[PDB]
Structure formats: structure tokens, C-alpha cells
Amino acid sequence: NDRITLPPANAQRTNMTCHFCIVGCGYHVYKWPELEEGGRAPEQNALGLDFRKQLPPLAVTLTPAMTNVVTEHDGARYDIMVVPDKACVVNSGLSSTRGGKMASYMYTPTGDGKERLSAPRLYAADEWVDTTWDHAMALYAGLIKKTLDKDGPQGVFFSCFDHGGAGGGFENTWGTGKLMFSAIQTPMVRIHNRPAYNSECHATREMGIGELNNAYEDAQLADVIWSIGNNPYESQTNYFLNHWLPNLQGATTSKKKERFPNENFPQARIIFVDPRETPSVAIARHVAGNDRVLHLAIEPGTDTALFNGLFTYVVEQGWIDKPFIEAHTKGFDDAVKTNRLSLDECSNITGVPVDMLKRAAEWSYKPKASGQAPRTMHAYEKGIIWGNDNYVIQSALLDLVIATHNVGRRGTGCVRMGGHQEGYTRPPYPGDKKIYIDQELIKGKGRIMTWWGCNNFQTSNNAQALREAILQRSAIVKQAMQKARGATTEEMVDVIYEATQNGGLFVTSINLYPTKLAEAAHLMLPAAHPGEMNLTSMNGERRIRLSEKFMDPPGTAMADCLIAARIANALRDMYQKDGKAEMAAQFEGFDWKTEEDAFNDGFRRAGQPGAPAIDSQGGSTGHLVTYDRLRKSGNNGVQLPVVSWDESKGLVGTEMLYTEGKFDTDDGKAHFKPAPWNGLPATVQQQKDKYRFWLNNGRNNEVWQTAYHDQYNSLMQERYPMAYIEMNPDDCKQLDVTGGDIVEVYNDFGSTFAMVYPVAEIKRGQTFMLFGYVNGIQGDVTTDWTDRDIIPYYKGTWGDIRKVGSMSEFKRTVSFKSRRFG
């Protein structure tokens, strides 16, 4: 309304890391009885702010959306207020539009979270009904046991989160990982954002450089920052705002000069490698001026040619660190030969003028007058990770970075900007083959498929072929269940199993909401998010924090690691009763009562005496971390790896990796790799040769992922009723479409729809459509093409556009004004 209820001076306050993106901004959650409130005097409210007169600008981040009233299981009502933590070094009090909505997205029976799953849901042949947890487990474990018994693990499929933050985290990745890999032991597992059990960073890791190798403070110390296939203002907001912008503004120069007394520090500059002119480029120009920003608007998919050209040039100029190369690397001479490309050929391929390539290299690699090489931080994200051959692009980029010693020096690093937070602790993947899960399902394999904390109907590449196949296979199982009457659970398990021998697939979804998966699912289990449970995760500089529980989950919703334990124990008991002792033993190790038990069993046991093989981002010193120690550390947490712990110093961590040149390889040296330039993959080139528009796709600053909460928010639905597609104005004029019209976007892979958004900055023949949304799924037009490790070129597709008509209500209510600040 037109007022807010302030938290009382003695209100309960707990720490909460943002549920959403990688930055991991720190927040506080204030909780107090509904009928109580703080006073306006500063010492009479928990914010410590004086509300007796107008507050000055930047004094607070507080709106009604940052407040809510929750109802606990005991029926007691409590005001909550979720606001950023001014003292957290990550965000220094900043809140993005996504994390600012956290209070609104907490569960309440009447608010935006009204439709949260709060009980097991079953599609009982021809209708959705509630069912009990015991029944859901007897059915689910029943189908898994029958499949293991008759087909083995190859018949049990999963697509599961492997990330941090909400819907992820060290407790949850361990629970699900132990269940899929150690207990069920199935290799038929894909990850939430890629169709196989693989890494987004195979090349950099094999070269010896883990992708999160620096601190956000390094962005403050850099002479030059590169943002490659990345739109940080919109996708890693507060890292860009609290660390990158102060450097461009000159607010960090004295820090640089203080650390390095005999080194020149010119005004900081920034270079964007992105085919598209984004809000991040616009803001960088507004802040630093045009002359301090280079936008390398490369032809889509030409990153490898760009980096091979830059690498060739700095080697020819001698703008490399020869002593570092000779002492700490292997493979340089071979890389010089294999990656040779002139600046003229580089320019011809990328479309970037030779002068701009030379300027980017001079700003970045030519020695400063005082002698030292510039400190150049090379940040990258999905424009290359989901780019034209993930493995090859990274090989090319890291060669340039290694040769110029831009890892291990403060103010540098070659790092992923990140998506979700990270929070990975799991047993090793139980297989030696790379398996394209969506293709196996489309071809008819598997008896049961579980989507866990993800929604590939909206996010898989070649999503239309996936939805077509899953809906059809699901229908076969429904039709078979329709014939039954009075069937016990055991008889239904056989009925469903037999249907799967006839083309069917039993589908389960473990999630916060029904989602579009409900159009095919036969069973849905309710999960709990941070605040309804404790949860640990780390951000883009490896800073691990504990988000504290402060309220009850809706109904019987449960932490994911505890759902995994419930499933494991249901299967153990079934095998015990069937007299299969060896099989039952596979399901031991899940006697957990709370998520902290999963933290102790996974993260804290990595590398310890008697522990099994565990792959953990916490490494072997993870045991030094405990919930109590994290809580004492506050939202600042500790940067991993933890070096030590004692009562007097608390947890002590690591700011930057590779500062001594000891890389993560056999010989401790960084390894150069060849990067052949092959042009666009034939699958993508065929669409490009047949269709008119490059169908770039990605993030919008206000929308979070598949809009699972945003779909219920009235302001979000008013602003973005449909997925939009940015189009060049001359292209729009030619096709007679303008803001608010709806178009069909299509190619050989699929057909989808979007509302047109004319954007002056978009190049002719190019477009950009919001990905993974609830109204107009972009992925239907992405191809099935993936690199050698099955990493999709999501950003590589072309298609045609057909006008449907004018959506009068969108024209009346949606702004189509510029989202680029200028």
C-alpha cells in the first residue's frame, strides 16, 4: 500500500544469501509477530534508520515487495522483511531487482507463492489428485526397483540441478548425487542446463585453470576488463555495479597505487566481445565515455578466430610474458603454429576492423611505461560457453590469457562470470561414456525419467523435439493406467512398467511448482527453498555462506537432500523385504533428519579418512567449515579453499588461485591447446543458409530463468506478458511489425512465438529473444548440435519470422521503450 510496517528494534534477524544469481549478494531476514512493529526513531526499529523525516538517497533499499506476512505450521503469522546487508563485501548493501523480490517469493497461502507444491501430486490416469508421501514413494521406488531388477540402472533417467543457491547447494547436490550415483548407480543422468553429464569448462580445467580463479576485488584492481559473451549488468548485476563500475569511475585507483607503488595505472578500460550491443555496453560507455570502451561486435560464432588473431598478434609483437611461459607452461610453440591467423584474416572472419583488434591488444597486453604488463581480467559467460564449439573457443581464449600471464596476478584472472551460485559435492559420475540424454529419451529409451529442480520443457536445446516425444510417451502410460480398477500400488507398478515396454515413460518432477512439466508428469513432489531450510553455497569468487532457515515450508514440502534420503530409504526397505541384501546395502547412508546431515556427510567428509570418492568444490579442507562457523562469519563467509580455522581467527580462506604458478595439471604448469577455426557447425550453417535471422537468445535483467516465481507476479506479468524478440527497426519496418505485434519464429527444428520489441541497437538480420520463458519458449528453434563433450551451441541458430498480428492489449499496457541507458 502506501506504508510499510517497520521491524521492531528486537526483531529476529537471520542471514540469507540471495536465492538467485552467482553474485550471491548478502541479505538479512527480519521476522517478527504480525501485530507488532518498530518505531520511526532510529533506535526503535531494527534497520537503525530515522523514519521521522525523509531519508537521504542511497540510505536504504526498502519497498513493499521486500516485505511479506508468512503463516507458520502452527498457524502463527509473522511479518518478514528481506533486505540487503550493507556490510557484506560482495554487494555492499545493493539488491538487484531479482533478489529484491525475495520476500514476495517466500511462500504464503495468499501471495505470489500460493501455488507452491505442498503435497505429492499424482496424475491418476485421467486427473491430477493429491496423494500421500508413502504412496508416492511406494510407486516411485517401486518402479525404480522393478527397472533395476529387470533392466539395470540404464532404465532409470534423471535431469538434475548441479548448481548452488536455491534449488541447489552443497546439501542438495550431495543428496541427489549420492542417490543417483552411489545408490541407484545410473549413468543416465543429464544436468539442468546441458544434456549430458559433462562440464561447461573441460578445456580450461584440462589446461590447469579452474574457472573461478580470482576475487571480485580483482575487478577493482584491473587496468582492463574483458566481458566475453556476457551481459553483466543484466546477468551478474551487483558484481558489475559494486566492483566493475567503481574501477571505471576511478574510485579504486588509490587502492591500485597503494598495492603497487612503482606501477603506472591508466584510467581503466573495458572491452566487450558480443555480436549484440547490450545494456552493459551502453552503461560502460555512459560511465567511462566512448573512448574507454571497445565493443568488438563480432560475427556470431567467430570467437575462436578473434582469439587466434589476438594471440598471433601479441606473440608477433612480443607482448607476452616470456619468463612466465618458460617457467610455468607447456605447449606454447605448438599453439603459435596451430593457432596462427593474421589480423587481416581475423578481421575478415569476425567483421571487426583491424584497427580495433590492434587497439584491444594495445590496451590489454602492451607493457605499461613503468614496465609491467597491464592487469587484464578476462571474464566470460554463455555467449562462448554455449557458443560455437565450447571446447575450441576456450582453448583459444586461455592460450591468449596464459601467454600474457593474465591468471594469478592481482587485477587479472580468466573466469566464468557464472550463472547460478555454485554448491557442488558429489560422488564421481558412474560411467565412462558421454550420453546425450534428450536424444536417448526421444529415441525411446528409459522406463522412468525424473526432472529434479529443472524444467527442460522450457530450457532444453531442440526443445520442441523433446516436448513432442515426452508428451507422447507420457500419454502411453496414462492410457495404460486408465484401464485399471482397484489396483494396489504393486499392481499399478506392473501396469506402468508394461506400458514402458510399449513406448511409454513414467515421468516425475521434484520442484517448487507444477510448471509446464505438469502437462506430462505422472508424479510431482514438493521441495523447499532457502529460508524454509538451511543451505550452503558459494558465489563467483568461491565465497561460501550459510542461508539460515527462518520459516516453515508449505504443507509437506521438503529439502531436496531429504527427498533423496526418503527415496533411498524406501528402496533400501523394499530390497531388504525382498531378501536382496547386496542391493539394499547400496542404499545405506541416508539416515538423515535435517539438511545439515547432508552437509556433514558430503562436503565435510571430502578427502577424509575412510570416506568414499567425493568430488567437492570445498576440497579436502571442507571439514573445517560447519554451520556454526559460517554463521559467525556472517554474509562475508569465507573464500574457498579454507586454509585454516581456529577460535581466534575464525575461518581463513584464499583470495586468488594460481598466484605461484602451480596449476591444476600433471606437471603443475598451464597447458596451451590448439584451437582450429572450423566455421559454423554444418547443422547450424544449414539453418543459416535457409533462413533469414540469427536467433540470438538469453537473459533479461528483470526475469529470473524459467520465471517459476515471476509467472505469478502481477508487475512481471504486466511488463512481460510474453517472451519478446528484439529486432532491428529496418527489419521490423520491412516485415510491417512493431512493438506489441506477435510473430511466429521458426526453422527446421521448431516453431515458437514472441512479441516484437523494436531495438535500434540490433543489427540487420539479427534478433535477440528472451530464453526459457512461460509464454513463447525460445528453445524450440535451437538445434540439436553439441560440441565434443555434448555442450550445445544454444546461441547458434537461424530462422524466419512471420507476423501473426497486433496484440492490442500489449500495445496498451507494455512499454517497448529502450532498455539501453543513454
Binding site: 500500500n1 502506501d2 506504508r3 510499510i4 517497520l6 520511526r40 523514519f51 521521522r52 523525516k53 525523509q54 531519508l55 537521504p56 538517497p57 542511497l58 540510505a59 536504504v60 533499499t61 519497498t63 513493499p64 515487495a65 521486500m66 545493493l94 539488491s95 538487484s96 531487482t97 529484491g100 523480490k101 514476495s104 549488468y233 548485476t237 555495479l241 545494456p279 552503461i283 555512459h286 535483467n701 528483470e702 508487475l715 504486466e718 511488463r719 496498451r812 499496457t813 507494455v814 512499454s815 521503450k817 529502450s818 532498455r819 541507458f821
Partner: protein, 133 residues
């Protein structure tokens, strides 16, 4: 009472406003800067004979920096973290970090006198516990 007591503050008469030329005024007190503008073309909720006069609080709802009106786009722009609001769509946030649209100052247009009067606010003005302190 469940409602706040908003003052009735004279802004100007409608015929004195020039198309797309913003008028600065404070409401509901001198610590709350606002802008009224006759847009030139009707918008839902605009008042006056052409249903095009609207007004807003200009303090950014993210962290309170004063926003500036851009006549060429008919938007209000915040220089702190780059949020921009649409004056033609009731303060709809076009792009930005705020979680609320720009607060709308409710105007009454009186045909008998031609007067425009600010009489309420829809949305909560930055930096205060209630719109009326």
C-alpha cells in the same frame, strides 16, 4: 481511519502546461519532489481535456536517487544504477533494479476552474515509512 491524510495541493491550471514541458513541484511535503507533464497524446489515467497530464514522484524506488525526465523518450532516468521508468505507462519500469513502478501522483482536473490538484499517491515514495510523514 485506514487511510493516510493526503493534502490537496494546487499544481497549476491545465492550460498553462506546455506539451512535454515538465513542471516541478513537491507533494505531499517539501521533502518529496515530483514532476507533472502534459504528454501531448492520451494515456490511460492521464487527466485534463486530452487525458494526457500525469505526475510522479521523481525519487527512484530502488535507492532514492532523483530521476530526470527525458523529453525525447518521455521517461524518467536514474543515474545511480540505471533504472528507467515509462511516463506513458504509469511509471512502468522499462529496465532496472527497482521492485516497484515509479509512484503516481493522483491529480484531480476541475473543468470549472481549469485547476490541476495533487490529491494522493499510488505507490510508496522512496525513503519513508508512509507517504505522509
Amino acid at each position: 481511519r485506514t487511510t493516510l491524510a493526503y493534502p490537496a495541493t494546487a499544481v497549476s491550471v491545465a492550460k498553462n502546461l506546455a506539451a512535454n514541458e515538465p513542471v516541478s513541484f513537491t507533494y505531499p511535503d517539501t521533502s518529496s519532489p515530483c514532476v507533472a507533464v502534459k504528454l501531448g497524446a492520451p494515456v490511460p489515467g492521464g487527466v485534463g481535456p486530452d487525458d494526457d497530464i500525469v505526475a510522479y514522484s521523481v525519487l527512484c524506488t530502488h535507492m532514492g536517487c532523483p530521476t530526470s525526465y527525458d523529453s525525447s523518450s518521455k521517461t524518467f532516468s536514474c543515474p545511480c544504477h540505471f533504472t528507467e521508468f515509462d511516463a506513458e505507462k504509469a511509471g512502468q519500469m522499462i529496465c532496472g533494479e527497482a521492485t516497484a513502478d515509479l509512484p503516481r501522483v493522483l491529480l484531480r482536473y476541475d473543468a470549472a476552474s481549469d485547476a490541476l490538484t495533487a490529491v494522493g499517491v499510488d505507490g510508496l515514495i522512496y525513503g519513508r515509512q508512509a507517504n505522509v510523514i
